[PDB]
Design a binder for these strands. Structure first.
Lengths: 50, 51, 35, 100, 83, 50, 230, 228
RNA sequence: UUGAUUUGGUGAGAGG
């Protein structure tokens, strides 16, 4: 169902897109995984520890 | 006040002066090692990965 | 000279905006006539 | 709004009382700068005590961990709401879901 | 500049006496009166001491010889100034 | 951890790539063939090393 | 030396914001070099105007709330930080927004001057609900590049300003997305030439041929240090 | 809206074919722009001339073996590819070398015309075991740009050359290695800047700063059209 | 000669 939903959107089925590099402008070999992860900011902030 | 001239003073007191970095559960002697500082815009100690 | 500075200041390293000031002080706080 | 959730975000965001869940359903008057004002539909409305529900939004204030607990209205003016529906999104909530 | 002190450890073969010899020398340069035996690249007295050690011109024997020479110079200065 | 993955992907081989079995006059033009886009990072090759 | 020179041959506007541009003809291998260099420069270093100081009447700090509106004041400052302005003559202007009555406050309600152009007439800012409510904010639009934030601009500002002016972060760069493609050129006698199809996505305020010209001048004046001195 | 121009602070000349152009300070994320642009131009676009084809007697393809030599013809092909020649007037010069006697054959042993010269005469070609061995090769030198290898050369050619002609990789561009870093410099307030350190090693026939200046003016004349 | 109070001790929770 993840693959079938990735086929409803026009995305590649493997979940992996070829990505270029912003520094060199040239392709990363062996396509990498891009997606959306729900990332959280925990309350261990660095200018309360320094 | 941290005026514009004390940062050159700071780069002239750092230069060849090592510091002892120490991770909090030190078990053997390789858990206290001395480095030379390189100043960081930031608030986090940048630590060389192999170490 | 013998007077001192206990005046509660802002702690070292923090910034911010004073969003609220509460005062249920010793029945007398009024400075000029604000109370 | 977590794109990949489990659907238990709704129950946690309602059942923890950080959002202003509507007590009696109906429409809205929406003064809201200070309080959500909800006109009540007649079936849920008592015969005496004509009555429209005025919800207090808790704006920027201190939590126990120095974070900011803040409620924001997620309903517009003149919009139907039902009993048990949410009206004001608390901290870390997005339209009644749970957005950490 | 300085990354490793390995040649200085080679020429004073104890690795615990290197610190003492270079500390005696860097106190001779810091307070100190003395001027270094080596060109300085805006290095501090630590690295100038260890950099003198690596080229084989400061060890414990040279420092004791120089302090006997300064003691004899102070002796001759006291004798030729008074008598 | 990252650096051993970078080495294990670098010094490896595959049975066909760009520049299979060509001959190279040194490691400097090996890196020049990798950067210009004429060979692959793992492509078996006779080099002349000293 | 058998090299050539490229020109901007066809500049198509797919919309007012998203717009491609060709480059023709490029030499062999130069396509990814110029494309990546123009990408890095066109994403880092373009000048665009943005909102810097917002001055609402009767509002002290940004974490308060106001009479008659939907969005709170932090929401208003975020929706103003997204604004897209295009001044022509000056480098620092002050706009005015005054509106009363029930209904949303678009960006088209700002009482414009002559040399400022607000290119998004459907940008929403407020949702005025009370008919007795009013809002009168005075925006200040500077012009720069990069990203300069409120913390650094807390002491950097020299002109002693009065207290009550909310400081909004400055997102100055009007380029948001840029992609280049190296196709095969259709040259009638050469087969070893290529074209560069740069696909920009702007803030609506920048003109793409002007942006490409400025990025080219930035690259040439940076390389003059290599050209002249050694 | 004014940009930081740098000063070229150092040319640490290690050898006559080595340099390290320390360069500071640039805007944040500009060292990679300049370095990558110069690196791609210096790799695959810089003009120059070297050996492309060679016709040798006694051999019929690249895997035969002539007598009198310790090394084989792959080694003579590789040591020929390592030779750096410069042509001044023309662009297609054929050269011929003949060597007999006990001793190695070096680059000074070749027969040269008035337009060509060798930048490293003590660069070895081969060695000779027999005093009766008479080696002979017809060394053709074209002039192109960058790098073209013998694999796609033999894929691109179609005309039937005579048997005994040998293809070699054409190291047209005179640089051998360019690889930079980007370090971090400091102007007294902003620490976000960055300093370029371009390393370069070439063959003969050029001075590394001349190669850098050539690549820079190649890119500037390439971008000379649509500027202000 | 130009200024001041937590460590003390308990309980609860957290990080590596």
């Amino acid at each position: 169902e993840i693959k079938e939903l990735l086929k409803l959107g026009d995305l590649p089925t493997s979940g992996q897109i070829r990505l270029y590099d912003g520094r060199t402008g040239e392709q990363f070999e062996r396509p990498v995984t891009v997606g959306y992860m729900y990332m959280l900011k925990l309350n261990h902030l660095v200018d309360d520890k320094m | 006040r941290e005026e514009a001239v004390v940062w050159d003073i700071l780069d002239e007191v750092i230069r060849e002066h090592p510091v002892l970095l120490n991770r909090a559960p030190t078990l053997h002697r390789l858990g206290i090692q001395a480095f030379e500082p390189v100043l960081i815009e930031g608030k986090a100690i940048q630590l060389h990965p192999l170490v | 000279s013998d007077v001192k500075d206990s005046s509660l200041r802002v702690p070292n390293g923090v910034s911010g905006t004073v969003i609220d000031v509460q005062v249920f002080t010793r029945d007398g706080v009024e400075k000029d006539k604000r109370a | 709004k977590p794109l990949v959730g489990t659907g238990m975000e709704r129950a946690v965001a309602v059942d923890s009382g950080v959002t202003a869940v509507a007590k009696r359903g109906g429409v809205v008057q929406y003064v809201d700068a200070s309080r959500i004002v909800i006109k009540v539909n007649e079936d849920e409305m008592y015969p005496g005590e004509a009555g429209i529900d005025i919800y207090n939004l808790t704006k920027y204030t201190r939590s126990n961990q120095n974070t900011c607990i803040n409620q924001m209205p997620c309903v517009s003016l003149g919009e139907p709401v039902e009993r048990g529906d949410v009206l004001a999104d608390g901290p870390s909530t997005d339209l009644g879901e749970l957005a950490l | 500049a300085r990354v490793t002190v390995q040649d200085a450890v080679e020429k004073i073969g104890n690795r615990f006496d290197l610190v003492l010899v270079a500390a005696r020398r860097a106190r001779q340069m810091q307070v100190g009166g003395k001027d270094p035996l080596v060109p300085e690249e805006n290095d501090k007295t630590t690295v100038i001491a260890l950099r003198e050690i690596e080229e084989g011109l400061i060890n414990n024997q040279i420092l004791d010889v120089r302090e006997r020479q300064e003691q004899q110079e102070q002796e001759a200065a006291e004798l030729q100034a008074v008598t | 951890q990252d650096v051993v993955l970078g080495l294990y992907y670098m010094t490896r081989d595959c049975v066909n790539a760009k520049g299979e079995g060509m001959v190279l006059t040194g490691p400097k033009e090996a890196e020049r063939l990798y950067r210009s886009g004429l060979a692959s990072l793992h492509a078996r090759v006779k080099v002349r090393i000293t | 030396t058998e090299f050539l020179k490229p020109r901007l041959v066809d500049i198509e506007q797919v919309s007012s914001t998203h717009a491609k541009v060709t480059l023709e003809p490029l030499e062999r291998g130069f396509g990814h070099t110029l494309g990546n260099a123009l990408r890095r420069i066109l994403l880092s270093s373009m000048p665009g105007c943005a909102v810097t100081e917002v001055e609402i009447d009767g509002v002290l700090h940004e974490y308060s709330t106001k009479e008659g509106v939907q969005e709170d004041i932090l929401e208003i400052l975020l929706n103003l930080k997204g604004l897209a302005v295009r001044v022509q003559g000056k480098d620092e202007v002050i706009l005015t927004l005054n509106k009363s009555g029930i209904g949303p406050v678009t960006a088209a309600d700002i009482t414009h001057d002559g040399d400022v152009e607000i290119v998004k007439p459907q940008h929403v800012i407020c949702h005025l609900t009370d008919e007795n409510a009013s809002i009168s904010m005075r925006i200040k639009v500077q012009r720069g590049r990069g990203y300069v934030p409120a913390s650094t601009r807390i002491h950097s500002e020299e002109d002693e300003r009065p207290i009550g002016r909310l400081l909004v972060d400055a997102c100055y760069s009007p380029v948001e997305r840029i992609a280049y493609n190296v196709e095969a050129a259709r040259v009638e006698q050469r087969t070893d030439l290529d074209k560069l199809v740069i696909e920009m996505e702007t803030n609506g305020t920048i003109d793409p041929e002007e942006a490409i010209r400025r990025a080219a001048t930035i690259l040439a004046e940076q390389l003059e240090a290599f050209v002249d001195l050694r």
